[PDB]
Amino acid sequence: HWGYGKHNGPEHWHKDFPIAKGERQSPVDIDTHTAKYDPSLKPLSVSYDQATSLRILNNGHAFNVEFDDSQDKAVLKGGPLDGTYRLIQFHFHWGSLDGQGSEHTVDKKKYAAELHLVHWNTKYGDFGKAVQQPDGLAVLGIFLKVGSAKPGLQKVVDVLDSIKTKGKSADFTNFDPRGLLPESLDYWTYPGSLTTPPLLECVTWIVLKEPISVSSEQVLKFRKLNFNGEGEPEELMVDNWRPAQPLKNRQIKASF
């Protein structure tokens, strides 16, 4: 099936998922000089104080920290959004080297990794229904640069040994996602898609301008994960990012 290798990577996805060459695919390069400030954009509202994390899962392409989304516990609203979007999971994309790893780029600059906090529009009832709608998901993207350690990320780094291979999961309760947010919530926003198959065009992207910094030891642990399942040849989970896609007929808006 699809993956990030030379024979099943991003350049091959369109064969099974034709929407890969669609009109609103992600990620994209954010040209900071061309993005336009939109004074009508409302401040973003990130309400994670009641977040209830449950489990962490290695799904063969990344690791997802899953949350209880059966009630409005952790939600994203405001900004370009109409309505309430519930946090369901977060995951990262990262590189084999500190100079690459993010999906979105800023003036062609690549960051070491990119965090995606995934939320679905409650007016659609469940995640599966939401991904079938143009305004079904809101994904908050946060860049990671290598420098100082991020204390709020250490609990995630420490449990990775327990989910080294595809299909492994571990209990992961009481994790506070507020510890992964930068100081500023200034952002860029545009309509796009999931960045892994099925590449559905159901995402309002909100990418924060301020990156968070993580230590080299922290990202090294990400790179020790495996794409393969236990007992299979070891393939390190690195470079699980899709490159920038054509912007086509879209405008990126800035909140600042």
Ligand SMILES: O=C(NCc1ccccc1)Nc1ccc2c(c1)[B-](O)(O)OC2
């Ligand atoms: O959930 C995904 N696939 C499986 C699936 C389940 C249910 C219905 C349809 C598909 N993919 C996916 C989900 C969320 C995000 C991304 C990819 B992302 O853009 O990297 O970050 C946000």
Ligand SMILES: [Zn+2]
């Ligand atoms: Zn992602």
